Design an enzyme around this catalytic site. Structure first.
Site, PDB file in Angstrom:
ATOM      1  N   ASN A  66      64.670   7.850  14.063  1.00 14.97           N
ATOM      2  CA  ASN A  66      64.761   9.381  13.659  1.00 14.97           C
ATOM      3  C   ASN A  66      66.263   9.697  13.526  1.00 14.97           C
ATOM      4  O   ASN A  66      66.921   9.413  14.271  1.00 14.97           O
ATOM      5  CB  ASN A  66      63.874  10.194  14.451  1.00 14.97           C
ATOM      6  N   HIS A  91      55.093  10.381   8.285  1.00 15.12           N
ATOM      7  CA  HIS A  91      56.319  10.035   7.496  1.00 15.12           C
ATOM      8  C   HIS A  91      56.078   9.641   6.157  1.00 15.12           C
ATOM      9  O   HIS A  91      56.661   8.724   5.392  1.00 15.12           O
ATOM     10  CB  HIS A  91      57.015   8.992   8.249  1.00 15.12           C
TER      11      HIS A  91
HETATM   12  C1  HEM Z   1      60.984   7.595  19.350  1.00 15.63           C
HETATM   13  C2  HEM Z   1      59.485   7.679  18.805  1.00 15.63           C
HETATM   14  C3  HEM Z   1      59.086   7.281  17.074  1.00 15.63           C
HETATM   15  C4  HEM Z   1      60.052   7.050  16.036  1.00 15.63           C
HETATM   16  C5  HEM Z   1      61.747   7.031  16.264  1.00 15.63           C
HETATM   17  C6  HEM Z   1      59.381   7.003  14.922  1.00 15.63           C
HETATM   18  C7  HEM Z   1      59.823   6.847  13.786  1.00 15.63           C
HETATM   19  C8  HEM Z   1      59.013   6.372  12.674  1.00 15.63           C
HETATM   20  C9  HEM Z   1      59.560   6.456  11.175  1.00 15.63           C
HETATM   21  C10 HEM Z   1      61.112   6.386  10.818  1.00 15.63           C
HETATM   22  C11 HEM Z   1      58.571   5.980  10.529  1.00 15.63           C
HETATM   23  C12 HEM Z   1      58.584   5.604   9.046  1.00 15.63           C
HETATM   24  C13 HEM Z   1      58.957   4.286   8.687  1.00 15.63           C
HETATM   25  C14 HEM Z   1      59.077   4.196   7.026  1.00 15.63           C
HETATM   26  O1  HEM Z   1      59.831   4.908   6.689  1.00 15.63           O
HETATM   27  O2  HEM Z   1      58.199   3.611   6.448  1.00 15.63           O
HETATM   28  C15 HEM Z   1      57.326   6.264  11.327  1.00 15.63           C
HETATM   29  C16 HEM Z   1      55.990   5.767  10.810  1.00 15.63           C
HETATM   30  C17 HEM Z   1      54.760   5.508  11.575  1.00 15.63           C
HETATM   31  N1  HEM Z   1      54.857   5.850  13.005  1.00 15.63           N
HETATM   32 FE1  HEM Z   1      56.422   6.474  14.221  1.00 15.63          FE
HETATM   33  N2  HEM Z   1      57.873   7.040  15.319  1.00 15.63           N
HETATM   34  C18 HEM Z   1      58.029   7.186  16.745  1.00 15.63           C
HETATM   35  C19 HEM Z   1      56.851   7.585  17.368  1.00 15.63           C
HETATM   36  C20 HEM Z   1      55.417   7.002  17.275  1.00 15.63           C
HETATM   37  C21 HEM Z   1      54.557   6.894  17.888  1.00 15.63           C
HETATM   38  C22 HEM Z   1      54.316   7.072  19.476  1.00 15.63           C
HETATM   39  C23 HEM Z   1      53.303   6.525  17.280  1.00 15.63           C
HETATM   40  C24 HEM Z   1      52.072   5.856  17.749  1.00 15.63           C
HETATM   41  C25 HEM Z   1      51.561   5.412  18.870  1.00 15.63           C
HETATM   42  C26 HEM Z   1      53.850   6.173  15.844  1.00 15.63           C
HETATM   43  C27 HEM Z   1      53.155   5.448  15.028  1.00 15.63           C
HETATM   44  C28 HEM Z   1      53.708   5.606  13.507  1.00 15.63           C
HETATM   45  C29 HEM Z   1      52.599   4.928  12.565  1.00 15.63           C
HETATM   46  C30 HEM Z   1      51.511   4.446  12.468  1.00 15.63           C
HETATM   47  C31 HEM Z   1      53.341   5.144  11.305  1.00 15.63           C
HETATM   48  C32 HEM Z   1      53.232   4.589   9.917  1.00 15.63           C
HETATM   49  C33 HEM Z   1      53.809   3.320   9.558  1.00 15.63           C
HETATM   50  C34 HEM Z   1      53.219   2.748   8.307  1.00 15.63           C
HETATM   51  O3  HEM Z   1      52.209   3.185   7.781  1.00 15.63           O
HETATM   52  O4  HEM Z   1      53.793   1.606   7.684  1.00 15.63           O
HETATM   53  N3  HEM Z   1      55.163   6.675  15.628  1.00 15.63           N
HETATM   54  N4  HEM Z   1      57.594   6.235  12.396  1.00 15.63           N
HETATM   55  O     O Z   2      55.879   8.250  13.923  1.00 13.76           O
END
Ligand code: HEM
Ligand code: O
Ligand code: HEM
Ligand code: O
Lengths: 682, 677, 356
Positions: A138, A65
Site C-alpha cells: 500500500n 481494491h
Molecule cells: C499490510 C496489509 C495489507 C496490504 C498491504 C494489502 C494490499 C492489497 C492490495 C494492493 C491489493 C490489490 C492487489 C491488486 O491490485 O490486484 C489487495 C487485495 C486483496 N486483499 Fe489485501 N492488503 C492487506 C491486508 C489484507 C488482509 C489482512 C486480508 C485478508 C486476511 C486481505 C485480503 C485481500 C484480498 C482477498 C484481496 C483481493 C485479491 C484478489 O481478488 O485478487 N488483505 N490487498
Molecule cells: O487488502
C-alpha cells in the site's frame, strides 16, 4: 519490451473476416428470422454464440481494491545482494526482471472515483527466473488491524451500509468510525488516510510499502528482518479534499489516465526499491514489536538502503485480460525470502489464494497469460476447470519408481528449492491471543502527526472534521473524540469544535513530542515537473490564440502537457470551456487577451456554462495551484480578487510567466492560501 | 407489507452468541497461534470459515445496468381489464399485487455515479398469482438498435475503451460517437439521452416505458398491440449537466439515497401504469413499423389509457440479497400477454435467461427469495447447483402412468396455461435481413421539435460537450453529417463548438411536426414534497434561531430542510465543509448569515475558502430557486444577483417561504441559460 | 473429458432442417458447456480450438486466454476500418442459411400429423433380422420388462408391443406371465430392408481379435502354447497364454483370466489336467475357473477349441467336436478352424429359439 512473453497470445483481427469462436466466416449483424418481419430462429447459432459470450463477460470484482489500474515495466538491481538474500532477482548488478504493477483504492467498487479518500494499493509482481515474487503493498506503511481474522470486520465497516449500499468509496459514515473508535489499533492508518496519502495527485506520486516485516535469507540460511519500501522518483504530491471531490465527478479516471498518458508520452515513472534491515535479536528493540503491522520503523533507527529501481514503461493491450485478471498473492514467495509471525500477514497467505477461486471460478488461474511465470512449472497437478495444458508424465505422483523420481524434490541444498528460515522456532501454549507487545495504539499516530507541517496537520484535522461530521450517532462521535484525545489533546479539541462537542480534558499517557522524517508530503518540492499539466485559458477572438500557441510550445519544451482552452475548437485549441475544469491541471495561466471571457459579454455565451472561465481560475487558486496571467490578462486575476504579487501568482510578460509557473510547479501546492486554526480570531 | 413473504428468511442476531456457519458458539477475533508470538495454525477452523466466506462475497456485476437501486411496493389494478387481457393481476378492480422495482443507469460499473448522463433502467416485477411478470423497461421510450444481435456492438462502444478502461459511465468518447454515426438508428435514443432524460433529478421523477410493442390477449385469443407506460405522480424533473458533474463527485449515491429517504420518511413515490392499445392492422399504419423499437407511437394517434397504480413503500433489509440478486427477464411472462416479432425483444428473451447463469453461477437462481414467485412451482426439474428443495414426486417425467399424469399440462383451454397468440403466422423465406419499413432513422429524432427552446439548447450543449471529447476528426465530421439529416440547425449549432463547417441542408427528413408528452421543462411539478432546501446560516449572532423557525415552517409543506453552519451547533444539520448545492433543490440564506459571504466570517478554518458563496453561486447558475431573508440580501448582492429576477426571492421570512415553495414547482428557472443567437 | 461437441458447430456448405429434435439440440449443447466448463471461453481450450482462426469482437469472460489487439471491438465502425468484416454467401466464404427455405403457417406448439406412425418402422426393423437375432431382441425385452414391479406398466408395454407384432408380444408375454393379447393388425407388415442386421454377415477381418490359450505350468503344455500363440499372432490376433502362475511365456494367471476378455478360447494340449481332479483344485485360482472359462466361451457363442489330448477338456463340459464353432485335432487344424470361426464371430446354433 516487458510484454514480450505476452505476444504469443495476441490476436490481430485487421484484414480478416468475422468468425464464430469455433471458426468459420460469418455475418452477425442480422438475426435469422422466419419471414420478412418474423420471429428469430432458435437455429441461429450465430446469434446465440455471439450473445452468450457477451452475456458472460463479467467476472466478480476484487473483494477489496476493486478499483485500480496497472502497467508493465522492468526492475533493475543495483548490485549483487547475495550477502543478504538468496533471491535470484537481486543476485547481480544490472540484472533485469519484468514487472507488472497495479495501483488501486480499497473500499470502492469497480466504477468508483480515483480521487476518493482512501488507502491506496501498490502491488508489484516480479517475474523472476525462480518464480513470481509479489510485493502486495500500500502507499501507507501501517495497516488498520493486528490480526487477519478481523479483516472482514474492518472491510464491512468501511464499505457501504448493507441495507442501502450507501455510501460509495468512503469512510465518512457511522459504521466506519464506529469501528475506528471501537478498535483503536486502526487510528494510525486512519491518520495516514486523513493526510495527503488519502488523496494523492497520482499513482506516480506515491511511495510504496510492504508494511509487514519479512525475512531475507541467504544460501547458508542466515536471516535478517526487512521492510520493503518504494520511493517515487516523481516525488510525493497530494491534492486538497475540496478539489478531489470535484475531480471525482469531473474525471473519475484521473489516476488511471495519468499513468497511461505518462507511459504513452515516453515519461515512464520510476520507483527505487529500498529496504530497512534489522537483526533478528532486535525485533522488539525499537519501542514496539516488529511483528506488529500497525507500526512503522522510524528511519532514524534504520535508514533505507536502495537495492534497485523499477520503471513502468508499457501500457496494457487489453485491460481486462491483463489488469483485471491479474491475481496478486503475498504467498507468491521465492527462495531467499521468508514470512514472519505477523498475525496479519499470516492470514493473508490463506486469503489471497482462496479468493482467486471466487474471482476466476477455478483452480487454473495461474495459467492465465498475465499470471504465468517465466521460469516454468513442473509438478503433478492435473485437471481442474479450464486446464490449458496437456501433461506428458502419466505417473503423476511421488514417490515413484516408474517416473524415475521426476519431477524431483528441491530444497535448501538440492535444486535451489524454497526453505523456511532454519532458525525459526515455536515456543509456548497454543493460544487465541495477541502479544502484549502489540498493545500501544496511540504513540505512533502521535508520532506521525508531530512530523507533519502546520498546514499539513490542518489538512488531517479538516479531513477528520469533514468525516466525523457525517456520523449521525452522537455516542459514536464522542467515542471518536475520546480516542482522538489519547493521541493529542489539541487534535481532539480542534476536531471537537466542528462536532459541537466539548473540548475533552488532557489524557497524557501516550502524549509525546518526537518527530520522524520521510512522513510528510508538502514539506518538499518535486524533483521534476515533467508530465505536469498546464491549462491555458484563451479565447477565439482577437490575437489571444496565437499567443497561447507560443506559450504552449515553450512550456512543452520543459516536458509539460499543455491544454489550450477556448470557446470552441478553433485551430490550436485542445479543449472547450464546456469540457474544461481546473481539476485537470496543475497550473492555470490566462493567455493575453482572454480577460474578455471573465467579464461582460464574453463571459456570457451559449457555448459554456455561465462563469466557467472565472470558475476555472478561482478553483485553481483556492486549491493552491500556481496560477498566472500574461500581459493584459492580469485583469482576469483582478476579477476574482487575486493579487499579482501573491505567492504562487505570476503576472507579466510571457517569458517571466513561463519561468514563474515552472518554478511554482515544483512547489506544487501553495499552503499560504489555507487557513489554520486560530487564524480568524479577533 | 410488500415484504411479508420474505419474513421467513430474515435472521436476527441480536442477543445471540457468534457461531460458525455450521453451528457452535465461537470467538473469532484472534487467530490460533503456536506460541505467544507464533505463526497461525492451519487447524484454526474458525479463521478459515470466516475468511472463506469473506473471500467469496462478490458475484459478477450485471453486464449492463450494473449501477442501480430498488425497493418493494404494491401495484393496484384500477379495474377488471378482462376485456383486453387475460392477465390475472389486471383481472379485478382494487386487486393488489406485490412488486419490486430496480432503477439503474446502463454503462457504468457498480460504483459509478448516479448522476452520470445515461439511459436509465426502470425494471418492475409483478409477483402475480399466476407467475412473475416483469416489465423490463427504460426511462426513454426508444432504444438504440433494431436487432438484438447488435447489442454487444452497442455496449462495447459505449463502455470504456478496452485498452485502458477509460472512460467510466460516459458516452463522451471516440468509440461511442463512432458507433452513433456508423449506425444511424441510434440517433433517436441518443437525442433522448442528450436531453433531460439523461440527467434526471431522481428515480421518482422519471417516466418508464416497456419500449417494445407487446400483445395483450384475452381468454378467447383475441389480441391487441400494446405499449407499456409508467407515468410518475411526482412529475418529470432533470438537472443541468454542469451540476450533475459536480454531484457525481459530491454524492455518487444521490439517486439511491433519494429513493431511500422518500420511502423511509413516508413519502412513497407512485407511478400510474398506462397503455396505448391499437389493433393488429395498425402495425404499419402510422408511418413506421411498430415492431421497430427505435420509434415511439405519438399519443395523438393513440392516447394513454390508465390501468392502475404502483407505489413503492418498503426499502430492502439487505441490499445484496434483494437488490443485487434480483434477476429480471422479459421472458418472465404470464397468461394474457404475448411477445411480438420485434427483433430486439426477440433476442432479449435469450439473453436475460442466459446471463443469469453467469451472475448466479448456477441454474437455481429462481429459488432465491427475491426471485421466488408467490404462486407455486410444480414441474419435473431436478438437481442443479444449490438445489434448495426436496422433491416428493419420484416420477419426474411426462407422460407417465406412474405419476397419474401430474404435474399436468395446462394450455388455453385447461389449467389457465400460457398460450401464444393463436392468430400469429409466419410467411416468407428464412432471412438475415431487416424489414425495409425499418429504414427511416431521422424523422422521429426530428422529438427535438417537441422541446422548449432552452430544452433544445440543453440537447445542443450536451452534444457539443460530448462530441468535443472525440479525438478523431473524421468521426466528428461523420457525426455532423448524421445530425444534418435530422435538422440543419442542430448540425450548424453543434459544428460551431467543434470548429467545423456543417454540411449543406439535407431536407429529405426535415419536418416541423410536434408531439406531446416528451418534454420535461414545459411542465411544473405537481408536488414539492420531499424536495430539499439548504438553509445557509452561521453560529454567530441570532441567525440559528431564525433558521430554525424557517426550517419549521418549510417542513410543514413536506420539504426536507438542512440547516448549514460553520460547525454542528444545536439545530445545525450539516457543516459548510460537508455541504454543496448539488444536494439541494433550493438554497436560502438565513438572516444574519451574510457575515460568512464576506469579511472575516468567510475565512474560517472550518470550511474551504469561499464555500458559502460557492453554494449560493452554484444554486443560482444551475437554475435553482434561491433566496435570502431580511439582512441576508447582502449575500445575494455579493454574487451579483438581484431581487427582480425570476426564482430569486428577498424580503421577510413569510415572503421568502411563499416564493421559494412556488419556485420549487418551477424547479428550474431557464431564463438563466443562454440560447444560440 | 474436456472436448465439447455441438450440432451447432456447422460450416459453410451444410445447413439444418426443421427436425424438431435437432432444433432444440442446437440450444442445449451450447448452453450445457456453461455448466460443464463454468465459463464462456471453453472453445479456447486446446482440444476445442479450430485450426482456421477466430476473428470477432468477443471479449472478456472467465479464463480469457487471449489478448486482443483491436480496441474497436464493435461493428459497424469507421475506426477499425470495417475489420473484422462481414462474410456471407457471395463474399468471405461466409455461412448462409439455405436460400430457398421458407416459413409458412400459424405459430404452433404441435407436431405434424406426418409424425404419427410409431409402429411400422419398428416392425420393419424386427423383420430384417435373423431368427436368432430376433430372439436376442425378444430375450432382451423379456429380461428388461421382468424388472418392472408395476403390473399395469407391464401390460402397457405389452399393449404397445402388440401394435408392432403380435408374435413379439406373445413371446414376451410368456416371460411376464401375462396373457397373449389378440392381434392388432393396423401396422403389421412383412417388409424387410438391408443394412440393419449384425449377425447375418461375417467379419471382414479378424485382426486384433483376442484368443485366450488355456495352458498349465506342468508338463510340456506351455511350450506348445507358445508355438500356438506365435502362429495365431501371424494373423493379427492378440493372444493371451493363461496358466496357474506367471511362468515364462505366461501372459495372465487363471485368477485374473475370464472368458469375457477373448473372442476365442482354445485349450493347449496337456492343459486338460486343470479341468478335473487335483489340477482343478489349487490355491492359485478360484475353484473350477479353467472349466468356467471354457463353459463361458462355449455358451456365449465363441469359437472354442482344444489341441490333441486337450479335447478331454471339451468332453469334460459336454461339448463335442461335431458342433459348429468347436475345433479339435492337431495344432494347424485348430488354428485354421479358430481363424475361420472368428470371422463368423458368434455361433448362433447355441441359442434356443421360441418353439424351435
Ligand atoms: C499490510 C496489509 C495489507 C496490504 C498491504 C494489502 C494490499 C492489497 C492490495 C494492493 C491489493 C490489490 C492487489 C491488486 O491490485 O490486484 C489487495 C487485495 C486483496 N486483499 Fe489485501 N492488503 C492487506 C491486508 C489484507 C488482509 C489482512 C486480508 C485478508 C486476511 C486481505 C485480503 C485481500 C484480498 C482477498 C484481496 C483481493 C485479491 C484478489 O481478488 O485478487 N488483505 N490487498
Ligand atoms: O487488502
Ligand atoms: C428496449 C430494449 C431494452 C431495454 C428496455 C432494457 C432494459 C434493461 C434493464 C432495466 C436492465 C436492468 C435490470 C435490473 O434492474 O436488474 C437490463 C439489463 C440487462 N439487459 Fe437490457 N434492455 C434493453 C436491451 C437489451 C438487449 C437488446 C439485450 C441483449 C440482447 C439486453 C441484455 C441485458 C442483460 C444481459 C442484462 C443483465 C440482466 C441481469 O444481469 O440480470 N438488453 N436491461
Ligand atoms: O440492457
Amino acid at each position: 519490451d516487458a510484454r514480450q512473453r505476452l505476444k504469443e497470445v495476441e490476436v490481430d483481427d485487421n484484414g480478416q473476416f468475422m468468425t464464430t469462436d469455433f471458426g468459420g466466416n460469418i455475418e452477425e449483424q442480422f438475426s435469422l428470422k422466419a419471414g420478412g418481419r418474423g420471429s428469430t430462429l432458435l437455429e441461429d447459432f450465430i446469434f446465440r454464440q455471439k450473445l452468450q459470450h457477451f452475456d458472460h463477460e463479467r467476472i466478480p470484482e476484487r473483494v477489496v481494491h476493486a478499483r485500480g489500474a496497472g502497467a508493465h515495466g522492468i526492475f533493475t538491481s543495483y548490485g549483487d545482494w547475495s550477502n543478504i538474500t538468496a533471491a535470484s532477482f537481486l543476485g547481480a548488478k544490472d540484472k533485469q526482471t519484468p514487472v507488472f504493477v497495479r495501483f488501486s483504492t480499497v473500499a470502492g467498487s469497480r466504477g468508483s472515483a480515483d480521487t476518493a479518500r482512501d488507502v491506496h494499493g501498490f502491488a508489484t509482481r516480479f517475474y523472476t527466473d525462480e518464480g513470481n515474487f509479489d510485493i502486495v503493498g500500500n502507499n501507507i506503511p501501517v495497516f488498520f488491524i493486528q490480526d487477519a481474522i478481523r479483516f472482514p470486520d474492518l472491510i464491512h465497516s468501511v464499505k457501504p451500509s448493507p441495507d442501502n449500499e450507501v455510501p460509495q468509496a468512503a469512510t465518512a459514515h457511522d459504521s466506519a468510525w464506529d469501528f475506528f473508535s471501537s478498535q483503536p489499533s486502526a487510528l494510525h492508518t486512519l491518520f495516514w488516510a486523513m493526510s495527503g496519502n488519502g488523496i494523492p495527485r497520482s499513482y506516480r506520486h506515491m511511495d510504496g510499502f510492504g508494511i509487514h516485516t519479512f525475512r531475507l535469507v541467504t544460501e547458508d540460511g542466515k536471516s535478517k528482518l526487512v521492510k520493503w519500501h518504494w520511493k517515487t522518483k516523481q516525488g510525493k504530491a497530494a491534492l486538497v479534499w475540496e478539489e478531489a471531490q470535484v475531480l471525482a465527478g469531473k474525471n473519475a479516471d484521473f489516476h488511471r489516465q495519468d499513468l497511461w498518458d505518462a507511459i504513452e508520452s515516453g515519461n515512464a515513472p520510476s520507483w527505487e526499491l529500498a529496504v530497512q534491515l534489522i537483526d533478528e535479536d532486535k525485533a522488539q528493540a525499537y519501542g514496539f514489536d516488529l511483528l506488529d503491522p500497525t507500526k512503522f520503523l522510524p528511519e532514524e533507527f534504520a535508514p533505507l538502503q536502495v537495492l534497485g529501481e523499477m520503471t513502468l514503461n508499457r501500457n496494457p493491450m487489453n485491460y481486462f485480460a491483463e489488469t483485471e485478471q491479474i491475481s496478486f498473492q503475498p504467498g507468491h514467495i521465492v527462495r531467499g525470502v521468508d514470512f514472519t509471525e505477523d498475525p496479519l500477514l499470516q492470514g493473508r497467505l490463506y486469503s489471497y489464494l482462496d479468493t482467486q477461486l471466487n474471482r476466476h471460478r477455478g483452480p487454473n488461474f495461474e495459467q492465465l497469460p498475465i499470471n504465468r511465470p517465466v521460469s516454468g512449472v513442473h509438478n503433478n497437478h492435473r485437471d481442474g476447470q479450464g486446464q490449458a495444458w496437456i501433461h506428458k508424465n502419466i505417473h503423476h505422483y511421488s514417490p515413484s519408481y516408474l517416473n524415475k523420481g521426476y519431477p524431483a524434490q528441491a530444497n535448501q541444498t538440492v535444486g535451489r528449492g524454497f526453505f523456511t528460515t532454519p532458525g525459526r522456532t515455536a515456543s509456548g501454549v497454543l493460544n487465541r491471543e495477541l502479544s502484549a507487545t502489540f498493545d500501544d495504539h496511540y504513540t505512533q499516530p502521535r508520532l506521525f502527526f508531530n512530523s507533519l507541517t502546520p498546514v499539513e496537520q490542518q489538512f488531517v484535522i479538516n479531513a477528520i472534521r469533514f468525516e466525523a461530521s457525517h456520523v449521525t450517532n452522537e455516542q459514536v462521535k464522542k467515542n471518536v473524540l475520546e480516542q482522538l484525545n489519547k493521541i493529542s489533546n489539541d487534535v481532539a479539541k480542534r476536531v471537537a469544535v466542528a462536532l459541537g462537542l466539548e473540548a475533552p480534558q488532557p489524557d497524557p499517557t501516550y502524549y509525546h513530542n518526537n518527530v520522524t522524517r520521510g512522513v510528510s508530503i508538502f514539506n518538499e518540492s518535486l524533483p521534476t515537473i515533467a508530465t505536469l499539466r498546464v491549462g491555458v485559458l484563451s479565447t477565439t477572438k482577437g490575437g489571444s490564440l496565437d499567443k497561447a500557441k507560443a506559450l504552449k510550445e515553450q512550456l512543452e519544451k520543459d516536458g509539460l502537457k499543455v491544454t489550450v482552452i477556448a470557446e470552441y475548437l478553433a485551430s490550436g485549441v485542445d479543449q472547450t470551456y464546456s469540457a474544461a475544469d481546473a481539476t485537470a491541471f496543475d497550473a492555470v495561466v490566462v493567455a493575453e487577451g482572454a480577460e474578455r471571457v471573465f467579464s461582460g459579454k464574453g463571459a456570457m455565451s451559449p457555448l459554456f456554462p455561465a462563469g466557467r472561465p472565472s470558475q476555472i481560475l478561482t478553483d485553481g487558486y483556492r486549491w493552491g495551484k500556481p496560477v498566472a496571467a500574461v500581459g493584459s490578462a492580469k485583469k482576469a486575476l483582478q476579477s476574482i480578487g487575486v493579487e499579482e504579487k501573491e505567492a504562487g501568482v505570476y503576472a507579466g510578460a510571457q517569458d517571466e510567466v513561463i519561468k514563474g509557473v515552472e518554478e511554482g510547479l515544483k512547489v506544487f501546492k501553495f499552503l499560504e492560501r489555507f487557513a489554520v486554526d486560530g487564524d480568524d480570531e479577533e
